[PDB]
């Protein structure tokens, strides 16, 4: 999902460059492949024409592309009644797990599951997401949102009985 | 989000303009670079060639790209009662905060919090976003928009008793 650049050094009048899928290039500093992914992965070529119509040596680099983690799922405690404590959970693995709120609040945990106490500003209804991250820094694809419902504690009922019995 | 533009003063035959993602152009004044993120950022090269046939040493330029705040969050005391003051405010760090009335009426403030008083022409109901701006003039993309609800204040009941007691 990132990018892959390449650049030049030298001031040579012209360039060639070559890669893993049919990638070529007559110009330094190449139009960057914005979606990377495996398929650009490979070595990349570069070979440089003088002024006075000589070739150089090829020089070349080799660019990998980390894989993101999958699309995680969640869990929720929803049918919550204000006041109470509310859990998010996921089995997905990672090595640091992305929370976000509905209203945008975005959070983080290297636990598995997040407790939000509710004084938090985090502490909202609506629907929650979640995103892990693995050891190569891959931000997986954003879980289905999970709503969360944080039920309001309803007012008392009048009570009493009929009045003194014999 | 802004563009990059590059001008010329010469009135030469033929221009060479080389750039950072196989940027280039044979014209004087080139198409703007209209979506500018800092791919484009970098040194732009130009080279002359005259009427007569020789070239110009190059001539360059360095073109920067400033980034933009993440987009900010807002809470808002949103189950609000006619006549109380209305108060949203963000965590998101700025220089300037940008407040964008439902209807469209568009305010400033250096505070995270504002407090709209209800003679202002800003208390009103509906969906509020907030967008901020960093050091640089940079403007975040706009928040999640967070729905404020004024409600009326209800009329009185009669009330009274079942009258004369002994």
Same mark, same amino acid.
């Given at each position: 999902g990132d990018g892959i650049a390449l650049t030049t050094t030298t001031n040579a009048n012209i360039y060639n460059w070559t890669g893993? &899928?049919?990638? *070529?290039? &007559?110009?330094? &500093? #190449? =139009?960057?492949?914005? #979606?990377?992914? *495996?398929? &650009?992965?490979g070595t990349y070529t570069l070979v440089v024409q003088d002024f006075n119509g000589c070739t150089s040596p090829a020089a070349s680099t080799v660019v990998t592309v980390n894989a993101a983690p999958a699309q995680p799922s969640m869990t929720t405690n929803s049918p919550i009644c204000n006041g109470a404590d509310l859990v998010m959970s996921t089995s997905a693995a990672g090595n640091s797990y992305i929370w976000r709120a509905p209203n945008g609040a975005d959070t983080t945990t290297a636990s598995s599951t997040l407790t939000i106490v509710p =004084?938090?500003?985090?502490?909202q209804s609506g629907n929650w997401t979640l995103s892990v991250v693995n050891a190569a820094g891959c931000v997986s694809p954003a879980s289905i949102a999970s709503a969360v419902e944080i039920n309001s504690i309803p007012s008392t009922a009048s009570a009493g009985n009929n009045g003194p019995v014999c």
């Open positions: 893993p &899928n049919g990638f *070529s290039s &007559n110009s330094p &500093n #190449p =139009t960057v492949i914005s #979606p990377a992914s *495996s398929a &650009n992965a =004084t938090s500003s985090l502490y």
